RNA sequence: CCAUCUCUAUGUUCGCCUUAGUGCCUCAUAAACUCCGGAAUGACGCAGAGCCGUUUACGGUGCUAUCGUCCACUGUCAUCAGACACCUGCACAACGUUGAGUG
């Protein structure tokens, strides 16, 4: 079935996280090179007990050895990279509140410096990290609840990006996530010679390019979304949906919509574009 | 170009009008008593971007004969609009007290020669900052004479989405105050509630980042005599999370903007 | 040296002394983790429960037979069921936490190879330079550089012990960084001091105000020493109210 | 006369500092072009005021040699000093947000997130030039105002004096000290009666002292500790600072450690003084 | 909402306790040992003034994959049809109701 791994600089609540995983029901352990230990945790796999592990300065290995252990993987349990982290100031505060002894800086380093040295040694495993959830602002009560759910959803499904334009005359869809209007932008019914020519039309699309100013918004919007996009990825939405609102498909400038479905698609997104209003009712 | 000046009695919030300058995009500088302000006007002429400036009593130059020398030094590249504003004296008497009106009254006399040179004199005690500003917008910036009422709504998805609007924004990604069982019944309008949210840094990040966007298309939206405009925000439970966000966006417009409303339709029920 | 193990707190306690430790080690993994441990050459302990325990303790007996003696095993084992066989019988020790608690546990000092050969006292002290420094002490520490509540008059009246006051302090990280390093300093020489006939040992902390800005510091220092287990009582010299 | 300049990370809330200067009485000008600054100093010369100004991030030179060339244009009779003020990105944003409105440039150029990040570069020249770097990372809007009162004579703090003063537990402890550490943990080679009459500053004993490398390791961690908040102590302007190490006999033990410490600052470059009072004769 | 007292950054001075060890016919290791004055402000305090009636018993699922496809028109309040998902005792103290209690 599955292998889970935890990581992050203290304050990550990697121990608060380990609580959540037995609550999850995965197997629970503290610290070891355990390079050949997952073969014997394969005994855990014989018992059908999905697994969970944590890594820290205490469980620190050689990056070569960290990935040598990734190499020594019984595939039956598939490790799922989960790391957490936050700004030095807070992590420090949190560790401090704990009487947890230390980052074990035998070098007699200070703690703030220790926080810095730590990110370096946690850098090889934090670059291999796959799910990264910051803990910077959550008190012990707030960390656990968010964690319960995020961990709980555990959805493999990625996000099918959906772009859509419509006509308010019929109205605004019911299934989108974000609702934008651009009636203010140039009109296709304007130059009614082009009014029949849909917005998708290439020469009409040449008239769309004219307004690089509109293209400002294209970029602006493009970015606006980008900002929350990473944020969005963690949740179990199977698909992200967005609605663009015009009076008709002509003004839809689904070109733009498709240039944003193509711009996000250039970024590498799963655009599953739709122009439902264009299609027959 | 357009050149502003600001003057008035101490405690009249000339600074508020200097802050109002930047809302209209104007560069400004604090406490410039120099008559090389014209030299400053060259630097601003090289920029060629309209700006503004004010006059403290420190700026009061003992010789207003020197004040007209400066305006003579001031070039064609800019045009001086004399703004003078003394609030109800009681308001002025009331205003100074925070974290008499006679020692101050002396300096009003000192400002009396330039207020005679003032294009206008305006009591700001009653005019709301946004309203007086719009007045200052319609007086100097010729703010268009149309009335685009602004509306802000907070709702929940399960109850649907109010049709009467141009904009909607989910916030489910923003951190939820419901994690706390004590504040789960606590409504969004509640101040303890405000706290969980305010503490969440990112929240504040969506607040103005988001506000930014609205502004980006706001001048483009003003035209077309939009009789009205509405924007809404939604939460899985519109009762708590979305309220502070829509309310936070609403205060920006109350101030920077004008004709904004607050509509928690989700809880408007009974 | 090696050991075999509110059992979690106890585990916390073993590494607080200095024991590298680990939780939930399957039995066959112990002789193998005693090879890794041999790399460490440091005293060790591990906590094992029923979920980890095998249906047959023959695996445990075989592991104890295969256990590297280079590391000397030690065994330990409850509470009243209101407050809550084959190898708990093998446990040389059996201890009850039904009413026994953290300082009482800090038992482990006598249970540890260490034993009470002498008594040592931790008496933590707060004072202001305005009346004068302590009549006598061992260590002294200005704390003025730390953020000061005097800034906010809201708390100006309230002393440090006051929780509202504690709060102003808590947000300030430097405090935590200052409180953390300091603890350590004392940790470093505490053993040598411990290895002495010194009857008592009194640190003292000074903020000019002499109340709000320092007592808390020493109260946080007093609660860390109490968690460690060392006898700890404090005297606000300014607040004796004489 | 005196001259002052303030700047820092946008969100430093440097604005309150203006009010702080205005409460002191300094003539406060804001967002002034750098080109106009030197003339400003000249007109201020007969103004007879300790000059004060704030450097807007908006006042970004786009010419670092020219920016250095205006700071150099500075005329006489006015004494410059640079104030910096920064804090955490996270802390700043909330504060920035508190700015009801602001445009850190980033107009069709960036989102707030990295305006401060590029600012770091824009301010790097300023931060280099900085003379009194400060942070408001935690001061709340109400508690920061009171922090501003910290301003005090650069002349008094101008003294970096710090002292290492031996004393004798037998006789007592000094009335003057901020850090006092008993340190009677390290061995007493003085217990050896042959070594007992070795001097308070005996040079031969240093081998016995070296023999207790664990006593010399002590020093390492001791330093390590001391330096942690030494910059924080710099703020006080306590014209001098005081650190005392005592021993019942006194110098036969303490005089050696301090010596090393003083040296440790005869290399770092700190004004250290070593007066062994225990080594005092009626 | 109190003049006007009193308490709330920096720098100046203040001696002895027979316990352990290097005399000399009386000066040495560990334990026991406590006091003020000179230049910021806040807190109170008795110079105005001001007076909300004071209040303090108990009630709310709000936790999250399709979809409600006329809003009808011709210049909309459809939540309401649900898949149903289940529910750590200072941040940490609401908004309704209610004790209790004068303006």
Residue numbers in the entry:
A (entry chain B): 1 to 61, 63 to 282
B (entry chain A): 1 to 99, 112 to 282
C (entry chain C): 2 to 6, 13 to 84, 86 to 92, 124 to 145, 147 to 282
D (entry chain D): 1 to 282
What does the paper say about this structure?
GlmZ stimulates translation of the mRNA encoding GlcN6P synthtase in Escherichia coli, but when bound by RapZ protein, the sRNA becomes inactivated through cleavage by the endoribonuclease RNase E. Here, we report the cryoEM structure of the RapZ:GlmZ complex, revealing a complementary match of the RapZ tetrameric quaternary structure to structural repeats in the sRNA. RapZ then presents GlmZ to the endoribonuclease RNase E in a manner that directs cleavage within the base‐pairing site of the sRNA, thereby inactivating it and silencing synthesis of the synthase (Göpel et al, 2013; Gonzalez et al, 2017; Durica‐Mitic et al, 2020). The protomers have two domains of roughly equal size: the N‐terminal domain (NTD) bears Walker A and B motifs and resembles an adenylate kinase, while the C‐terminal domain (CTD) bears structural similarity with the sugar‐binding domain of phosphofructokinase.
A map of the binary complex was obtained at 4.4 Å resolution based on Fourier shell correlation. Remaining density allowed for the building of the first two stem loops of GlmZ RNA (SLI and SLII). The RNA stem loops are primarily contacted by the CTD dimers of RapZ; SLI interacts with the CTD dimer formed by chains C and D, whilst SLII interacts with the dimer formed by chains A and B. For both stem loops, the path of the RNA across the CTD dimer has approximately two‐fold symmetry, and the conformation of the duplex changes from A‐form to a highly underwound helix near the dyad symmetry axis (roughly between residue K170 of chains A and B, respectively). Several basic residues (K170, R184, K194, R196, R211, R238, K251) form patterns of positive charges on the CTD surface providing a favourable electrostatic match to the path of the sRNA. The phosphate backbones of each of the two stem loops of GlmZ align with corresponding putative ligand‐binding pockets formed by the CTDs of chains A/B and C/D, respectively. The Walker A and B motifs located in the N‐terminal domain of RapZ are not positioned to contact the RNA substrate, instead they appear to run along the opposite diagonal of the RapZ tetramer to the RNA. The RNase E cleavage site in GlmZ, which resides within the single‐stranded region located between SLII and SLIII, is not resolved in our cryoEM maps and is likely disordered. The binary complex is also likely to resemble the postcleavage product, where only the SLI and SLII are bound by RapZ.
